[PDB]
Amino acid sequence: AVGACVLCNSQTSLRCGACIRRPFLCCKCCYDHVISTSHKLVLSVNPYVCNAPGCDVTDVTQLYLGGMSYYCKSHKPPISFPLCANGQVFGLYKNTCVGSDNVTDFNAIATCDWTNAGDYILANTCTERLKLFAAETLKATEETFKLSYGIATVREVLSDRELHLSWEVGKPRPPLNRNYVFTGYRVTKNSKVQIGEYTFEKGAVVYRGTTTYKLNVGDYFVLTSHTVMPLSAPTLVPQEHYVRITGLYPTLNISDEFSSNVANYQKVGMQKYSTLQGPPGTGKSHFAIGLALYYPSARIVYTACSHAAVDALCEKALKYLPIDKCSRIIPAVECFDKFKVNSTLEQYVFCTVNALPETTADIVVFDEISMATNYDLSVVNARLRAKHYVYIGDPAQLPAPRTLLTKGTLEPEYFNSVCRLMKTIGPDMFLGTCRRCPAEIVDTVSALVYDNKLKAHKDKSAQCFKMFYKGVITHDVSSAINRPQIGVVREFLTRNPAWRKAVFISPYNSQNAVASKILGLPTQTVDSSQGSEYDYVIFTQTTETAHSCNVNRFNVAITRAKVGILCIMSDRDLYDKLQFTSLEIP
Amino acid sequence: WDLLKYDFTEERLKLFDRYFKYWDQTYHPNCVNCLDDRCILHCANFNVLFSTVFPPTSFGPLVRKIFVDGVPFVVSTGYHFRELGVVHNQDVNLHSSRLSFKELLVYAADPAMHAASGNLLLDKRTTCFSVAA
Amino acid sequence: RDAAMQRKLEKMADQAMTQMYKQARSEDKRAKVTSAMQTMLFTMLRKLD
Ligand SMILES: [Zn+2]
Ligand SMILES: [Zn+2]
Ligand SMILES: [Zn+2]
Numbered sequence A: 001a002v003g004a005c006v007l008c009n010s011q012t013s014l015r016c017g018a019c020i021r022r023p024f025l026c027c028k029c030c031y032d033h034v035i036s037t038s039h040k041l042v043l044s045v046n047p048y049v050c051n052a053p054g055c056d057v058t059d060v061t062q063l064y065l066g067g068m069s070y071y072c073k074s075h076k077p078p079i080s081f082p083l084c085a086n087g088q089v090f091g092l093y094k095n096t097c098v099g100s101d102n103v104t105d106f107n108a109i110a111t112c113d114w115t116n117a118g119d120y121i122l123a124n125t126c127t128e129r130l131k132l133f134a135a136e137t138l139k140a141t142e143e144t145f146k147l148s149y150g151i152a153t154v155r156e157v158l159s160d161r162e163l164h165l166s167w168e169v170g171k172p173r174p175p176l177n178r179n180y181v182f183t184g185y186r187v188t189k190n191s192k193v194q195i196g197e198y199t200f201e202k203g204a205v206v207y208r209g210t211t212t213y214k215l216n217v218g219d220y221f222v223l224t225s226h227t228v229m230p231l232s233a234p235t236l237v238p239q240e241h242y243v244r245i246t247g248l249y250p251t252l253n254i255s256d257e258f259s260s261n262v263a264n265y266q267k268v269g270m271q272k273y274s275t276l277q278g279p280p281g282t283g284k285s286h287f288a289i290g291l292a293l294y295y296p297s298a299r300i301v302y303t304a305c306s307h308a309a310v311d312a313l314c315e316k317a318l319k320y321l322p323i324d325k326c327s328r329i330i331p332a333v334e335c336f337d338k339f340k341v342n343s344t345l346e347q348y349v350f351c352t353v354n355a356l357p358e359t360t361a362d363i364v365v366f367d368e369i370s371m372a373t374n375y376d377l378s379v380v381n382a383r384l385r386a387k388h389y390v391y392i393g394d395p396a397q398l399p400a401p402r403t404l405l406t407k408g409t410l411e412p413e414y415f416n417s418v419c420r421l422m423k424t425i426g427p428d429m430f431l432g433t434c435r436r437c438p439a440e441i442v443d444t445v446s447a448l449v450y451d452n453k454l455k456a457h458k459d460k461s462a463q464c465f466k467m468f469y470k471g472v473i474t475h476d477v478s479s480a481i482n483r484p485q486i487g488v489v490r491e492f493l494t495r496n497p498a499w500r501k502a503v504f505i506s507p508y509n510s511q512n513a514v515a516s517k518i519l520g521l522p523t524q525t526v527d528s529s530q531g532s533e534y535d536y537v538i539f540t541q542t543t544e545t546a547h548s549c550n551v552n553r554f555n556v557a558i559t560r561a562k563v564g565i566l567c568i569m570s571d572r573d574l575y576d577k578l579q580f581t582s583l584e585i586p
Numbered sequence B: 001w002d003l004l005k006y007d008f009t010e011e012r013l014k015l016f017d018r019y020f021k022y023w024d025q026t027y028h029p030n031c032v033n034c035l036d037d038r039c040i041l042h043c044a045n046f047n048v049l050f051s052t053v054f055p056p057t058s059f060g061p062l063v064r065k066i067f068v069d070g071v072p073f074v075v076s077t078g079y080h081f082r083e084l085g086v087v088h089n090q091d092v093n094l095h096s097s098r099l100s101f102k103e104l105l106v107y108a109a110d111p112a113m114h115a116a117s118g119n120l121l122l123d124k125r126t127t128c129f130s131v132a133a
Numbered sequence C: 001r002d003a004a005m006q007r008k009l010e011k012m013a014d015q016a017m018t019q020m021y022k023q024a025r026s027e028d029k030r031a032k033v034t035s036a037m038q039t040m041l042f043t044m045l046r047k048l049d
Helices: A027-035 A104-111 A117-124 A128-146 A262-268 A287-294 A310-320 A374-383 A417-423 A439-448 A483-493 A510-515 B009-019 B037-051 B102-109 B111-116 C005-045
Strands: A014-016 A063-066 A069-072 A152-159 A162-166 A273-277 A300-303 A348-350 A359-367 A384-392 A502-505 A536-539 B060-068 B071-081 B085-088
Touching: A014 A027, A027 A104, A063 C005, A104 A117, A104 A128, A117 A128, A128 A374, A262 A273, A262 A287, A273 A417, A287 A300, A287 A310, A287 A359, A287 A384, A300 A310, A300 A384, A310 A348, A359 A374, A374 A384, A374 A417, B009 B037, B009 B085, B060 B085, B060 B111, B071 B102, B071 B111, B071 C005, B102 B111, B102 C005, B111 C005
Parallel strands: A273 A384, A300 A348, A300 A359, A359 A384, A502 A536
Antiparallel strands: A063 A069, A152 A162, B060 B071, B071 B085
16 A cells, blocks of 8 residues: 555555566656556556456556546546656655656566566666566566466376376476476365475476375376565665674684584685585585584575475584474475474574565575576575675576576576676675585686686596587477487497486476386486585587577586586587597497 | 254243143243244243243353354454343354454443353352353 | 636646545555554564464
8 A cells, every 4th residue: 555665765655566576666656657568557556457347548648536536538627737747756655755866677677578688688677676576577477478388187197206187278297307396286175185295397297396195086287386475674784894803702712523614614704695616515505504604603594485495404404403402393395304393492593485484593505596586585594684795606507497587598697686796896805715525626617607616636547538429409398319328328338337326307307208118217307406416427419599598507417526527519619628538430 | 952953943832832821822931932922921821830940051042153354352242131022143154354343342242252261250148050250 | 717717727736636645654654554454463473373
């Protein structure tokens, strides 16, 4: 009804009815949003619509104030008053308003339904309130676009990891990634009951769930979304250089367990909010864990953008942090239940943004910052309030699911508010001791993107081979089939069966789908796999398009392996750049 | 009598057949089934006599457990009048997503939640049937 | 006329703004009363054993 403006933060009672989020607009702001857009519906304590019976006009500049209600020209009384006057729509606080000359950003956010990268660019290069409004508009249009997908009406239940599933005709196929988890709710005899949340992924759909369930007749799974509440808290408060190490309690005993992280902790203790630019596996999973032990005097709160990515966090947290004094609140999908519920007052808290109550802390760490959006940052800052925020990662990771983005992919420095200051003014802190990846990968990434800030771990065995295949591009639904790659797989596996002890990594599971006819292994997606990796890796890119497999996709996807990784450089990008072995067919 | 029992519709008919066997007018133990206001008055007159037999704990709001946001509620989905007999609500939602204002007002005005959330009251100062504190 | 129709329009606008303020305050009171009643119901249901 009444609230602060988006452009001025001034109290107003005008909301754009044609805006999907309906933000509060000042009188001058409402006038600006009305004249320069087709948004002719403006909302108040009463809708600005012609209340005369038998009329259907829903304009604002054509609407006139008649009596106690609103009318158009065709129905206005002789005593009439134009709603659009003095460059401001008639509303509450018509004399206490300042306006703003920056109106094109709001119109671009509202008019454009998030079709290209420039919308996100202008959303990130603005103030906090406009950015939050853009984030919630993006979430609303994301929900609208997600609700326009197919509905899985299960006609038969065949077995596990495979279903006899069919759908309607015309409705499109859900995407490959896990960003489209189904959380539908079916009815059996009288009303709705519990179903559960699962992330169905394409391997007749394979489910990446650790539990079992038997479906029934008439049960359907829908892309259930939520209602985006208004976002109040900003992403981050402005930084300020402290004179001393305050806000965290200095203890006389220091930890010598991580000698190369004491300086990093000292530098974090001087900055309000900080983020360290490191490749995946550069102490990313345990930096905050070692921080919680270096200074066991700060309320450390762990949070992630995915509920299935918390297993990597909990894998070593129980070995490093105590298990008895740590607990997880169970809401009334597979996590530990041996912890103690309703532990409001605890030094270490593990929870998710979906059901995070109001609390306070001193140090908050947000791992996997790439897949979190400005709306996610606002939610994190509103659920948990602290004077310090720590971000682990870098913009050069897997980007957020920009599903509505049709044109070129967004630049890394425009993903979030953190990515803005992470790449424009310069990384606040950097890691120079990366003893996790060998000379090959570390040298490649240092020469490629990481400002030659990474040094060789050990010698390069140079055991990786790349064959020169060409292949043909042919799309059927969303993938491609390459018989020559089937040939090279055998020509590589012929030497020894011991090569197979590896984790199959592929953004698109078409290879697994083809192989399932003879092998049938369950399918898992690499979206949430950081912190756990094997020595050998099986890599099949199978793609060359910049729409998804762009330049900032492989430089961090090759860093997972320790010493053994498939380095098939079928793309004509880095073939004549490194010195590996290659041979022709004898 | 059973404490949970509130209907007594069969008992009222048995009383009517025992004491007014040849009363040549149809008697409705529940006044929901009456024809007009005159029949409502006629059957309520018999219900007045017949309610002096049944326990006073079986009259008042008829409550049942309903769920809102999956959380159980105790609301009156009916009433057992000493004169009007057993009356059941027609728009009763055993489950609901949320209540905006009207159902919230009804359940707030409903003595069901307050009586269920109050301490048992035995007020010996008055002979009136105490409910809860 | 400029001091009779325009002055009347100004009075009508002031009256409409006053009615809008009263309606906004009524909606705020409705929200507060709704929250209070909902919290009362939810805090008395928890004592039901
Ligand atoms: Zn709008
Ligand atoms: Zn404004
Ligand atoms: Zn009209």
